Amino acid sequence: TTIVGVKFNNGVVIAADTRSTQGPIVADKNCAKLHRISPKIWCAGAGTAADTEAVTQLIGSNIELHSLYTSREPRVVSALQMLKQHLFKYQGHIGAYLIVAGVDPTGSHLFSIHAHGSTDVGYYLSLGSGSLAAMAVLESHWKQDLTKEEAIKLASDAIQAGIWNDLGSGSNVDVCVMEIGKDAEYLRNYLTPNVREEKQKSYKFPRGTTAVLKESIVNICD
Amino acid sequence: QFNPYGDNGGTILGIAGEDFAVLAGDTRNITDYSINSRYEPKVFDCGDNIVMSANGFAADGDALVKRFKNSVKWYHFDHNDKKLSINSAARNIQHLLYGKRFFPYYVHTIIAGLDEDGKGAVYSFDPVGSYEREQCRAGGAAASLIMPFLDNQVNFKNQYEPGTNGKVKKPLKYLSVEEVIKLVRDSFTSATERHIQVGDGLEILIVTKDGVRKEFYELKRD
Amino acid sequence: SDPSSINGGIVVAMTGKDCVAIACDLRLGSQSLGVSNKFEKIFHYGHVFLGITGLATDVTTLNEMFRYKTNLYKLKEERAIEPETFTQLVSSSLYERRFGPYFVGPVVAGINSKSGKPFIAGFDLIGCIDEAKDFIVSGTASDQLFGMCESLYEPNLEPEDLFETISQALLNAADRDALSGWGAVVYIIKKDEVVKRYLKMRQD
Amino acid sequence: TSIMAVTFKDGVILGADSRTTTGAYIANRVTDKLTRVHDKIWCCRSGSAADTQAIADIVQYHLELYTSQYGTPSTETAASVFKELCYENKDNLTAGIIVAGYDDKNKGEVYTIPLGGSVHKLPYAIAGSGSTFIYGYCDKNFRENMSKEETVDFIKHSLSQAIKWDGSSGGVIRMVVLTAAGVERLIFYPDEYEQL
Amino acid sequence: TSIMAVTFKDGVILGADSRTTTGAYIANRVTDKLTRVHDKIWCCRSGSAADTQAIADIVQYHLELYTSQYGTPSTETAASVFKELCYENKDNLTAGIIVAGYDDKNKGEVYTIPLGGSVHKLPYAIAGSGSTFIYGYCDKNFRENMSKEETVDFIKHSLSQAIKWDGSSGGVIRMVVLTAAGVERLIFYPDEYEQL
Amino acid sequence: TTTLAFRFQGGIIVAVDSRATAGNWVASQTVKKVIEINPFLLGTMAGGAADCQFWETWLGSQCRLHELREKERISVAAASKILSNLVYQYKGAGLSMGTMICGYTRKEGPTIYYVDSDGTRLKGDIFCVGSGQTFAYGVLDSNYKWDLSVEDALYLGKRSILAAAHRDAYSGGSVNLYHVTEDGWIYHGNHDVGELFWKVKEEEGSFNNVIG
Amino acid sequence: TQQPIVTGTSVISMKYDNGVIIAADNLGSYGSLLRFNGVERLIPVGDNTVVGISGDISDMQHIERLLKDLVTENAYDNPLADAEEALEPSYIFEYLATVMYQRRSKMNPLWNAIIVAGVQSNGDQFLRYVNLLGVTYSSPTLATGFGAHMANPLLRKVVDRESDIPKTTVQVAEEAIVNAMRVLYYRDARSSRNFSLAIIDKNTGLTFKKNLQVENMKWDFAKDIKGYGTQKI
Amino acid sequence: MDIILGIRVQDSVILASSKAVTRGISVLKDSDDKTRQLSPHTLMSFAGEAGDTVQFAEYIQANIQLYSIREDYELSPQAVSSFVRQELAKSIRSRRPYQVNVLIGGYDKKKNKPELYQIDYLGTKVELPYGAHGYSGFYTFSLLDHHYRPDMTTEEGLDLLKLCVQELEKRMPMDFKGVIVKIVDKDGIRQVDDF
Amino acid sequence: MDIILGIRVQDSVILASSKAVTRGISVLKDSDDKTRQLSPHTLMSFAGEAGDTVQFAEYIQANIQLYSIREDYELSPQAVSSFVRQELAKSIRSRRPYQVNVLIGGYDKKKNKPELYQIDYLGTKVELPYGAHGYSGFYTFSLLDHHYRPDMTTEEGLDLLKLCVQELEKRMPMDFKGVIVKIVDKDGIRQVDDFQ
Amino acid sequence: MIEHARTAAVTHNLYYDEDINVESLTQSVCDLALRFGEERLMSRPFGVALLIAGHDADDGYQLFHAEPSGTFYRYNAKAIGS
Numbered sequence A: 001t002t003i004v005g006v007k008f009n010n011g012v013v014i015a016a017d018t019r020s021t022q023g024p025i026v027a028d029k030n031c032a033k034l035h036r037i038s039p040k041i042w043c044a045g046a047g048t049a050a051d052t053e054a055v056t057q058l059i060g061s062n063i064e065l066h067s068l069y070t071s072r073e074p075r076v077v078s079a080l081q082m083l084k085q086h087l088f089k090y091q092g093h094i095g096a097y098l099i100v101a102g103v104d105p106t107g108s109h110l111f112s113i114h115a116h117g118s119t120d121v122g123y124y125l126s127l128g129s130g131s132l133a134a135m136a137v138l139e140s141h142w143k144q145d146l147t148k149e150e151a152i153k154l155a156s157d158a159i160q161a162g163i164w165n166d167l168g169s170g171s172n173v174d175v176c177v178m179e180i181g182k183d184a185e186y187l188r189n190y191l192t193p194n195v196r197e198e199k200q201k202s203y204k205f206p207r208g209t210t211a212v213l214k215e216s217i218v219n220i221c222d
Numbered sequence B: 001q002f003n004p005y006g007d008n009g010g011t012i013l014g015i016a017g018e019d020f021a022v023l024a025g026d027t028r029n030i031t032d033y034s035i036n037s038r039y040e041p042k043v044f045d046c047g048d049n050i051v052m053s054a055n056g057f058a059a060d061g062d063a064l065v066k067r068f069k070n071s072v073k074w075y076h077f078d079h080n081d082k083k084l085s086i087n088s089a090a091r092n093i094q095h096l097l098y099g100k101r102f103f104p105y106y107v108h109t110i111i112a113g114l115d116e117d118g119k120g121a122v123y124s125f126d127p128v129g130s131y132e133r134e135q136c137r138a139g140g141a142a143a144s145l146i147m148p149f150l151d152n153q154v155n156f157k158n159q160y161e162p163g164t165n166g167k168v169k170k171p172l173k174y175l176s177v178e179e180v181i182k183l184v185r186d187s188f189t190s191a192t193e194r195h196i197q198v199g200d201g202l203e204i205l206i207v208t209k210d211g212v213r214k215e216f217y218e219l220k221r222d
Numbered sequence C: 001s002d003p004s005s006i007n008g009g010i011v012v013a014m015t016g017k018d019c020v021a022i023a024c025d026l027r028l029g030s031q032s033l034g035v036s037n038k039f040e041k042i043f044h045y046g047h048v049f050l051g052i053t054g055l056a057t058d059v060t061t062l063n064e065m066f067r068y069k070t071n072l073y074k075l076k077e078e079r080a081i082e083p084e085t086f087t088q089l090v091s092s093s094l095y096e097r098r099f100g101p102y103f104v105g106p107v108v109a110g111i112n113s114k115s116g117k118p119f120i121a122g123f124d125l126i127g128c129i130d131e132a133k134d135f136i137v138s139g140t141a142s143d144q145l146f147g148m149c150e151s152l153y154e155p156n157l158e159p160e161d162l163f164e165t166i167s168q169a170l171l172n173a174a175d176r177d178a179l180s181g182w183g184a185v186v187y188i189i190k191k192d193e194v195v196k197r198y199l200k201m202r203q204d
Numbered sequence D, E: 001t002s003i004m005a006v007t008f009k010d011g012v013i014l015g016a017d018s019r020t021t022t023g024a025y026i027a028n029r030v031t032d033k034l035t036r037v038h039d040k041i042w043c044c045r046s047g048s049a050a051d052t053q054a055i056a057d058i059v060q061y062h063l064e065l066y067t068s069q070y071g072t073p074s075t076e077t078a079a080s081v082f083k084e085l086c087y088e089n090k091d092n093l094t095a096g097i098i099v100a101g102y103d104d105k106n107k108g109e110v111y112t113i114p115l116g117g118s119v120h121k122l123p124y125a126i127a128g129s130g131s132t133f134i135y136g137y138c139d140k141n142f143r144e145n146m147s148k149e150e151t152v153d154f155i156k157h158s159l160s161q162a163i164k165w166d167g168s169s170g171g172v173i174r175m176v177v178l179t180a181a182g183v184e185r186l187i188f189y190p191d192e193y194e195q196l
Numbered sequence F: 001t002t003t004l005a006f007r008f009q010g011g012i013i014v015a016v017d018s019r020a021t022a023g024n025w026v027a028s029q030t031v032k033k034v035i036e037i038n039p040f041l042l043g044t045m046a047g048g049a050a051d052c053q054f055w056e057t058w059l060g061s062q063c064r065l066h067e068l069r070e071k072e073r074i075s076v077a078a079a080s081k082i083l084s085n086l087v088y089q090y091k092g093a094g095l096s097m098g099t100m101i102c103g104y105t106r107k108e109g110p111t112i113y114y115v116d117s118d119g120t121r122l123k124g125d126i127f128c129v130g131s132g133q134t135f136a137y138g139v140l141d142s143n144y145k146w147d148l149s150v151e152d153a154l155y156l157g158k159r160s161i162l163a164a165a166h167r168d169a170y171s172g173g174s175v176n177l178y179h180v181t182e183d184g185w186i187y188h189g190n191h192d193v194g195e196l197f198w199k200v201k202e203e204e205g206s207f208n209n210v211i212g
Numbered sequence G: 001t002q003q004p005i006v007t008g009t010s011v012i013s014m015k016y017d018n019g020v021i022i023a024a025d026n027l028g029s030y031g032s033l034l035r036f037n038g039v040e041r042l043i044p045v046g047d048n049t050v051v052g053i054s055g056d057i058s059d060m061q062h063i064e065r066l067l068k069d070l071v072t073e074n075a076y077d078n079p080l081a082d083a084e085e086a087l088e089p090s091y092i093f094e095y096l097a098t099v100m101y102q103r104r105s106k107m108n109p110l111w112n113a114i115i116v117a118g119v120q121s122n123g124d125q126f127l128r129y130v131n132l133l134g135v136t137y138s139s140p141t142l143a144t145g146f147g148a149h150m151a152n153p154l155l156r157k158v159v160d161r162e163s164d165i166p167k168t169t170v171q172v173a174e175e176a177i178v179n180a181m182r183v184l185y186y187r188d189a190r191s192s193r194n195f196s197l198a199i200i201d202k203n204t205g206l207t208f209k210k211n212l213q214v215e216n217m218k219w220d221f222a223k224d225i226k227g228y229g230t231q232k233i
Numbered sequence H: 001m002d003i004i005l006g007i008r009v010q011d012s013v014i015l016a017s018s019k020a021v022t023r024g025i026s027v028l029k030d031s032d033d034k035t036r037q038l039s040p041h042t043l044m045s046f047a048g049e050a051g052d053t054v055q056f057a058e059y060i061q062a063n064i065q066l067y068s069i070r071e072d073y074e075l076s077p078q079a080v081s082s083f084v085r086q087e088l089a090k091s092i093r094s095r096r097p098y099q100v101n102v103l104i105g106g107y108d109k110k111k112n113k114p115e116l117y118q119i120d121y122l123g124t125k126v127e128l129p130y131g132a133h134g135y136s137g138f139y140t141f142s143l144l145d146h147h148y149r150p151d152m153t154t155e156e157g158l159d160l161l162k163l164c165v166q167e168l169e170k171r172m173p174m175d176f177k178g179v180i181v182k183i184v185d186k187d188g189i190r191q192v193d194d195f
Numbered sequence I: 001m002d003i004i005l006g007i008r009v010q011d012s013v014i015l016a017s018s019k020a021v022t023r024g025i026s027v028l029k030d031s032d033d034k035t036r037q038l039s040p041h042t043l044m045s046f047a048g049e050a051g052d053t054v055q056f057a058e059y060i061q062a063n064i065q066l067y068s069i070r071e072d073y074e075l076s077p078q079a080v081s082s083f084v085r086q087e088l089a090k091s092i093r094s095r096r097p098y099q100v101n102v103l104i105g106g107y108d109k110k111k112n113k114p115e116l117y118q119i120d121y122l123g124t125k126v127e128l129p130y131g132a133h134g135y136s137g138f139y140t141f142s143l144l145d146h147h148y149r150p151d152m153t154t155e156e157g158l159d160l161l162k163l164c165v166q167e168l169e170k171r172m173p174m175d176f177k178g179v180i181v182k183i184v185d186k187d188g189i190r191q192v193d194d195f196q
Numbered sequence J: 001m002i003e004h005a006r007t008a009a010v011t012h013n014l015y016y017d018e019d020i021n022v023e024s025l026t027q028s029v030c031d032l033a034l035r036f037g038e039e040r041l042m043s044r045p046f047g048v049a050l051l052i053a054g055h056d057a058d059d060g061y062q063l064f065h066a067e068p069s070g071t072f073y074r075y076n077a078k079a080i081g082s
């Protein structure tokens, strides 16, 4: 997994790969890792995928309840504090590492949360297996006062570095942009550089190839 | 604390034909979740129409290949430049491997060539030298992913004649060199798709009664 | 001694043109010793199908619990549960025991009654949803099934062809696994017709 | 991690580095290791980032409630809150915290709490991984009732030596000055303290 | 144990403490941690007393034989002998040795050899348990081509701070000055360097 | 792995499977677990694959050496004890081999020896070694008779290997069957377990629990 | 050697149209302590080979002595030590790799990762790697430690395949190497701002630059970072 | 361990259980009935950890008897097997789980059919024509798979169990001191006088 | 373990040895003779680790036969017992010791007296009227201590051993598949045709 | 000499799963001849000549004369002795 977040002058972008692996085996070649805590607060996950998904959904539900209670737009600091307190409560046993970006009434926010309950703030962040490779791109190409397209390109290039030079990442690149004045735009498969080449032969078997002992219709209706 | 063994990934496959043999392997060499090289060949021509690969610990593989090449050199020197038969090479490799029975070469070995009758031949060796001649054999990381596929398309396993209701099995045939090349490329593309340690490139050595030729094909780099 | 490898078994689901398929092995054994050749792993709730691989007792417990939950769901909503809703239910039920997990690998398959969309999904022992459109695999021969599927599959398969493909994949993966085999079943699920066929394979 | 707090005639100054590393990889090189628990009561944290952040958040909550109920807390009160949280949960916490405050009654005060929850009031306190490398220098270069400029220089030199020798420390030197005039944040970049 | 060696314009000076402890008990409080391997080549020892003593005895034997055969050895030669003995037996040795010598050609030289047998030539070298506490001070107070008095003062202050902070060091500060004039042995008692 | 050997009036019957596994992954099903030591001596490969194969081939070389030195066929006891002494010299070093050396000599008649990596050397009449030794033992001990014909003894060995391959998960692939008389050994074919199961089920009326 | 003591961090190297470039920091770390500076980890052998060693510094000095002895032995009874019969990079590599694999096989390895970079007699660029396990691999970009994780992506963006080597200039390769050194200094706790860099060009020869420093560092944005989430001052 | 065998012949279920309980190097008893009559037409044989077996068996027995008294009705063998499987599945993840393996043999009067269930200490239930717990199966199955016919009579099943017991007495490293054999049919549960 | 029993009657020594060899969960053989005729008037029964038993027994047999051939004389049972005890005592401190327990039954023709020796894998030799190796003694002794009389005939000793075998077949968790019984008297070593 | 020749033949068979060539066997035997002198040496050279006949697939039928001089010759017909 390779996830990155980059803040630009008018908001924040996050990006991730789309390769979920069960050990050395690729389980899903198009697993979206960008989750939605709130309509304009998103987060990329790494580590125990089930733990990340579950804590993100729980904090998103509680944040939606909080917004319906306070009649105010959700805030990134609130999701940050709730995630951090829960993770610290379970003493890192929830193996979730998140890069949480968002736009709220207070502005743009980009943070990172670790499984044990620590949080970091920065303009560019990277987490996951390829987090080093992506970071190599970031530290090489990040500057203050980035434009939207500049930050998008930087995040996509960091994710591409994680895809090419890290065995834990690959496939496509998902992006989510959150600008101050607009809605959040979730570009699923923003870049698809790993299209599979056409197979050398078709393996459509001639019907009747498999030996069948007995067939019986099963009534699914009631 | 010093572990004298390491894993470099990789996948090799050898298919024996009627009048030819083919030994192919991915050109990717890795360590943990990082890529060490995208073209470090492991399928070597050792002369006398004998191609050899020892996939696994790259150091042990290189050592075993070097020792076998030296053994072929000394065999030519000591026995009137007699050509080394593939079965003789297999027995010599068994003895080489079992020499380090208690410090095994952490490599699965596959050699390919032509037998004394001019037929294609492939021999497989476990790390300590248990050897067997087989029609098709894959070894390495994606071995578990390729060996069943071969059973379905090389030996026609579980494939029965259409319309015979599983009474008559599929008639076995000798696949052409083009067919085995197709099958090898499809196997390696699928391995690149589903295995993180396979990709970058596929190098095929084809041993016919006219000698050894090469065929290189690009693979996905994720 | 691995709780997922004491009893053994394999399940694989695939999709095609307006159809899905879900297949499983029929083997149950105490490691080396094979005990039962009639342990089917594909259960059905309404028009959704669930194949569970892993520790057999957890498989049966999950089957019973999900039957319970789907029955209560139908009694409350007065409608049959859809594959996506059941997938979410399986994920939530699995994660509910995150620190005391069920050593299983559920796989859901079906066709959405209202939209006709073929839908398959997989899970790990803690409920991580793996929603692939091509195929989902689980069991002791997960790697062999992965190879067979990534090699044989091509999208938009008719039921009679998807059956052959999934059956060949399951058989050639089970013959490469010592803890899988002893029979196999394949369900071909269409919008209004679901057929179940027992396969003939090696009993070793 | 290299942290310190020094009391000078006008108040107190906390100083720290900005390098938080997971092993040998610099996870964050712009970390703000100076945390505010009250308007003029700050803390330098060392050790488990999660533990230190949780302790600081709980102390800030308790001090906000104390402010709302009984007025401005003394530096000693924040020190005791930190001490309670660290000592009672010593078997599950890995945090060493220096607490520096300024109140017109007691001037400026510094309390260091190492592992175990012990609390020690000191004129100047140093802590963290790099502190071991500047124990001598500080003891040879510390004076009481210093001025703002010389106290900043002392903290800068100490943290520069700590960063130079301890690989676990680095980045930029951040200082927080608590005086009657208020709270001032100073930053010194590597191109400045490396040439010292 | 706290040991160091400093090169000044007239030659070199080795300095050490005198506290050898078996655990928390001060086994010997008058230990002579400065050992002579040649007339103007000495070594400061840290670590396993048995290992350091055996290494020093074997080095003294080899240097005596070198003197008998090929004349007076260079400081680098004794450094290389120490390096061989430590590196080849790294799996069975726990010793860190500083070697300081004076020869009219190269003036004074200092070679520190830590664990593992690596040899590093330095203008001034520090080692031992207390060294970690004086890494900063020394780097801030060391200068090249100092005078004899200034070198003695530098070593005295560094070892005094190390003794103050490191409990494994203590006793009296022992120094050996190697110059063209010869070998001088200096001792400084606690009642002197504690007030520094 | 399941290997069996038993002596009867017609000679010796040897029957092995062909499955080699590394855990749950069947590495191969074309393994030859009967090692043709020489035209008169056979060995069963149960245990460590490379260990058994290498050391039984070395045993064959030593038997050829003995025949060159003494101008006389080596006795089954002699070769079995050679292998036993070798493995005892390698005892504790990590070898794992449970093999049966079977032969038919003029002095000894039909003779079967069990030699294991622990140095145990046992002359016997009915021996089963491997993960599925229990199943073949059951079948044989139930249906064994010294007065069996060559055909019936061959079928009994094949059926015991079949039962083992069915129940045992680590045994399977194919059945290799050998018949050893005084004039040497005779190969009686390689029978694929997949088809042999259905044939035996239809002809024997057995394996009723399985449906086909 | 069973446990490294004084350790050397990353080493980086790449190929360009006319040769190779290698670089390494000048830091000897005593674990977490940045104990020694000015420790040269690039060892030149002749006018066509540079060996970059990362790991146990004692074993690095042992390899230095071994390389010097190899040069001395190749000088013996060799009137062509100046020309055809001079030490080629491939010879030095293969020797070091044999030594490393032997030390591994004896359960007493040289705790090092070595990158041999040079130009052969025929002008071909030689870049190869060995480690304490004896593993050998060659790629247009090669790095050790954190180098292999961070510098390799940046350097591969310049030369992803062999076909990119003829197009890459010496200036591009040197700039990429300097950028990789800066990135390592950013995100490697055991890195040093002072490093050394060797360029082996089949035409220019061996250029060895010592005492180089990381320049043009971006640290201003650190002033805007406040707290770890909710804090503002 | 202890020998627990079961076979399902036409209109009957035969259960065999070792008579030996040995703690240490001394065989404490050679006449142990490792079965519990759950209901007049359902018997359960048990083996495993000392103490847990008898406790779990008597607990299940009490529960089944209470159900039969409350509803004035005998639960089908399938229902009893499901109940025992749920009990064992709840046990496996408890503080101290039950390490007991059971064979349930019953005669479903509603179907007039014999039913045999094998359940382990983990809660793995299977309905099989022949079943065994422990190492016993490792031998017995090989015989049964060959000599079992679905239309077998009760005497044929007894002879088959005798062959299995002979094989166990030959190739087992332990002397289980014979077996107690019980037959469950439409007329209830009876004990073979001598096997 | 394997059952190894021996009794010494007025004019004979009777040895009982298990017929069962079991590797794993399968009894490989039910007719195993766990004895080796060392000399025409001296037999030795053995039990213990697989392989070591037969190897040690045949080694002792070869040595005793070589001595009897060289000196044309049969060594007394005491000499053979001392030799095997010395062999086992040398074995215990070797790299891979012999884990074999033996009972030696002989008839000293020079004394015309029966003699029974018990030796374990450690080299602990004792001359006893009745002896047993393994758990067997834990039962058999209790019988023998009551039912053994020095003037017992060979038939009385056989009946006593049969009673011991019955008790073992009753209260042992193992089926040793009967015992092979051998009688050593003035006329040599003979085997009882049937003992059950 | 005969023992060494037999051992070399069977060892080449074990190592290469093939029959040793006649010339190779004759050379291996001759290699022992000059291993004499004053434990890699013996007291005296051999006092016997050998006619080594054989057949291999490479050179067909072959006859060799092997002397204690370590030298061997291929004869179409050779007589040695009195």
Ligand SMILES: C/C=C\NC(=O)[C@H]1NC(=O)[C@H](CC(N)=O)NC(=O)[C@@H](NC(=O)C(=O)[C@H](C)CC)Cc2ccc(O)c(c2)-c2cccc3c2NC(=O)[C@@]3(O)[C@@H]1O
Binding pocket: B104, B125, B126, B127, B128, B130, F001, F019, F020, F021, F022, F023, F027, F031, F033, F045, F046, F047, F048, F049, F050, F094, F096
């Ligand atoms: C073949 C007929 C009967 N014999 C078997 O059938 C047995 N061996 C095998 O399959 C495979 C062959 C193959 N090509 O896979 N051997 C290895 O892998 C080798 N292991 C290795 O190199 C390793 O250490 C790595 C961890 C593996 C990559 C050789 C070896 C080494 C030490 C051993 O103690 C054994 C085997 C061993 C002994 C007793 C029984 C078994 C063994 N090993 C098992 O795996 C098995 O259990 C199986 O039964």
Ligand SMILES: [Mg+2]
Binding pocket: B191, B192, B193, B194, B195, B196, B197, B198, B199, B220, B221, B222
């Ligand atoms: Mg890949």
Ligand SMILES: [Mg+2]
Binding pocket: A162, A163, A164, A165, A166, A167, A168, A169, A170, B221, B222
């Ligand atoms: Mg990648």
Ligand SMILES: [Mg+2]
Binding pocket: C174, C175, C176, C177, C178, C179, C180, C181, C182, C204
């Ligand atoms: Mg199978």
Ligand SMILES: [Mg+2]
Binding pocket: C034, C203, C204, F164, F165, F166, F167, F168, F169, F170, F171, F172
């Ligand atoms: Mg089977």
